[PDB]
Amino acid sequence: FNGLTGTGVLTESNKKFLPFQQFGRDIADTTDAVRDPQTLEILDITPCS
Amino acid sequence: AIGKIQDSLSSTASALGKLQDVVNQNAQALNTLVKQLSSNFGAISSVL
Numbered sequence: 001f002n003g004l005t006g007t008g009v010l011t012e013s014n015k016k017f018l019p020f021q022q023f024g025r026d027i028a029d030t031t032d033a034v035r036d037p038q039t040l041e042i043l044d045i046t047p048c049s
Numbered sequence: 050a051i052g053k054i055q056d057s058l059s060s061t062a063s064a065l066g067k068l069q070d071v072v073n074q075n076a077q078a079l080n081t082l083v084k085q086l087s088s089n090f091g092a093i094s095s096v097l
């Protein structure tokens with residue numbers, strides 16, 4: 001996503017990103033959730049099992 | 050005496066502080082270990 005490389009599972013979520021917010025971060029600044037740059041929708045990033 | 054111990058355990062939350070401190074210390078160690086991934090350590094970024 002816009003050069004942010006990672007491995008995980010993209011699922012539909014309910015985390016209301018603010019309109020100026022593009023990336024979400026965890027405690028250890030791992031990418032928790034992203035907004036898709038094409039369609040303005042919200043997705044979690046859960047790393048694979 | 051058994052009833053008094055029951056009332057004391059129901060009323061005082063600091064009676065089991067000897068176990069609560071162990072659980073809290075484990076939580077602090079785990080949280081510190083997680084949060085140490087956010088440090089740059091002199092590099093350009095903390096994200097691999």
Ligand SMILES: *[C@@H]1O[C@H](CO)[C@@H](O)[C@H](O)[C@H]1NC(C)=O
Nearest residue numbers: 002035036037038039040041
């Ligand atoms: C990507 O394409 C959709 C139409 O499929 C369009 O609505 C959207 O605005 C485009 N993304 C950007 C950033 O313009």
